Write a protein that binds this ligand. Structure first.
Ligand SMILES: [Mn+2]
Ligand SMILES: [Mn+2]
Ligand code: NA
Length: 592
């Protein structure tokens, strides 16, 4: 019994299964106190003040209620070599490759994990508070939303999870006796400290391990307090666990932005998009379009959960409640909507601090006022090695985005009429092309690169990628399902295209193609825009010949390399339809 150690809330008031989870890991981890989070503003402010008192965070006096954390240099990102999924058979988690290691995930046996678990978690929270975070992934009470409970010994995680999810007493009420994802986290530094504490950031880099057990509905993470390792809603739940749930239940959990686009007549369409690059999604999702009368609005910039309703519409929600964006490259010039979002109630991690209480990073594109000296993320003076860590972050409420979509919290979701795959390619791949079919579209997603990153999901596949491809293809056999039109974009051909707000011109063409305009020319790789199909007013003389140019020699090599990749990495689980599209594309290119 742990009722004596409860410092907020009550074990009695919890649902029986939530109590089992809290009390069981309390017995294992042995925390001093147990804090059931209510999600309130009072709880949030006093927790920030407590982190301030202990040197864990610093207040940023320039802004309204903004904070800065500086971490141990050994704990600054997701570590893929210590990120694992546990199933009975390895084959269900990753395809068995013909050669070498799998690039599509990392499996660990139930037995191996059991040893690792017992060598870490017993007594790991000694002298620390165990925070119980009840959180909803998606608008509270949405039919697409899923609920979880995160146990953690890190106040930084609690604060960050308040921004990145809906959390508090309301989630416990909405949950009741229903199912939830069990999330267990520890920084892995029980008191008294065995190891020395670096920069007031508790971590155990040697024993760091981020484990997923989809069959048990469990995420178990140890040793890292950073981002995707500690905010277990973000990658562990929303992509890795969710994609397995999505396979079982007939929906999709994807690494996609969701944006709403409006034409000058007020007609609205929603698009989803997967890019492998860090900045690529936020650039597009928070874009200021340069075309007169066109509007762009953000539903989300990272995760999309998509399900077909009874009318056959692919409905999407953003399961997150905030933005955990990469800080470097966030420019006052070329990303003003993102900068506006972060001016209040934002937790920054590993960015540089100015003398006047502001933030700084590489690519901010705003010169500092005279006198203003910079302190780097290592807490030392800096003079124009980088001032901010390249994977440094802002953690900010989604509601504060100036162009947040009015339907971003709609429980039914938004109707996805188009899915966009993206890649940074210097040669060969045109500005934009549209997939010939759903099956070809799935192949396009599988052939993405900028290391190859199919669906932008390489580090996040929750199960076998071959079976993931088969799951995608199976959507074409759902009764009366209106399949989204699929496109591939490449802003970075050479640079022949300005990009930024001008990409709205490419989105107009996608919009019109969805409406059924004959504004397309057929090519061996798919449909491209016609001569004069794009709106180029205000751009001068852009080289549309070389920009939409399709070289026989390039694409011959491209399909060969895709063939080798998919044969090697997906192997026996590669669905016939993907191997068909590959040979079909190979054949179309041979006839050029
Ligand atoms: Mn203290
Ligand atoms: Mn992401
Ligand atoms: Na610190």
């Amino acid at each position: 019994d742990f009722s004596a150690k409860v410092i907020q809330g009550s074990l009695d008031s919890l649902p029986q299964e939530v109590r089992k989870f809290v009390e069981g890991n309390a017995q294992l981890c042995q925390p001093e106190y147990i804090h059931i989070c209510d999600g309130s503003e009072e709880e949030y402010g006093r927790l920030l003040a407590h982190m301030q008192e202990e040197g864990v965070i610093r207040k940023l006096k320039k802004y309204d209620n903004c904070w800065l954390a500086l971490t141990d240099p050994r704990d600054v990102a997701r570590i893929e070599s210590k990120t694992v999924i546990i199933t009975q058979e390895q084959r269900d988690t990753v395809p068995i490759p013909k050669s070498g290691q799998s690039q599509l995930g990392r499996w660990m046996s139930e037995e191996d994990f059991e040893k690792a678990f017992n060598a870490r978690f017993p007594g790991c929270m000694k002298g620390r508070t165990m925070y119980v975070i009840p959180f909803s992934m998606g608008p509270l009470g949405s039919p697409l939303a899923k609920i979880g409970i995160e146990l953690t010994d890190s106040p930084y995680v609690v604060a960050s999870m308040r921004i990145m999810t809906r959390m508090g007493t309301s989630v416990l009420e909405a949950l009741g006796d229903g199912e939830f994802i069990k999330c267990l986290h520890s920084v892995g530094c029980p008191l008294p400290l065995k190891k020395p504490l670096v920069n007031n950031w508790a971590c155990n880099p040697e024993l760091t391990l981020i484990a997923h057990l989809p069959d048990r509905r469990e995420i178990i993470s140890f040793g890292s307090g950073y981002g995707g390792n500690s905010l277990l809603g973000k990658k562990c739940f929303a992509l890795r666990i969710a994609s397995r749930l999505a396979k079982e239940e007939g929906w999709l959990a994807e690494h996609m932005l969701i944006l709403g686009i409006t034409n000058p007549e007020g007609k609205k369409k929603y698009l989803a998009a997967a890019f492998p690059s860090a900045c690529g999604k936020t650039n597009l999702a928070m874009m200021n379009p340069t075309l007169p009368g066109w509007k762009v609005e953000c539903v989300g910039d990272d995760i999309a959960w998509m399900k077909f309703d009874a009318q056959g519409n692919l409905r999407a929600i953003n399961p997150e409640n905030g933005f955990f964006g990469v800080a470097p490259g966030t420019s006052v010039k070329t990303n003003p909507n993102a900068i506006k979002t972060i001016q209040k109630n934002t937790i920054f991690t590993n960015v540089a601090e100015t003398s006047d209480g502001g933030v700084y990073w590489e690519g901010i594109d705003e010169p500092l006022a005279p006198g203003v000296t910079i302190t780097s993320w290592k807490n030392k003076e800096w003079r124009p090695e980088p001032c901010a860590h390249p994977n440094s972050r802002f953690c900010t409420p989604a509601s504060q985005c100036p162009i947040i979509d009015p339907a971003w919290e709609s429980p039914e979701g938004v109707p996805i009429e188009g899915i966009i795959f993206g890649g940074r390619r210097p040669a060969g791949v045109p500005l934009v092309y549209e997939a010939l079919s759903w099956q070809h579209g799935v192949f396009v997603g599988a052939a993405m690169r900028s290391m190859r990153d199919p669906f932008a999901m390489r580090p996040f596949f929750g199960y076998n990628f071959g079976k993931y491809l088969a799951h995608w293809l199976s959507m074409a056999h759902r009764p009366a399902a209106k399949l989204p039109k699929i496109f591939h974009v490449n802003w970075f051909r050479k640079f022949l295209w300005p990009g930024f707000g001008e990409n709205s011109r490419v989105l107009e063409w996608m919009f019109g193609r969805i409406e059924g305009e004959d504004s397309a020319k057929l090519t061996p790789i798919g449909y491209v825009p016609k001569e004069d199909a794009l709106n180029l007013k205000g751009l001068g003389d852009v080289n549309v010949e070389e920009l939409f140019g399709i070289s026989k020699e390039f694409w011959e090599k491209e399909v060969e390399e895709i063939d080798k990749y998919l044969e090697d990495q997906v192997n026996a689980d590669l669905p016939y339809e993907i191997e068909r599209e590959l040979r079909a594309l190979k054949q179309r290119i041979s006839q050029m």
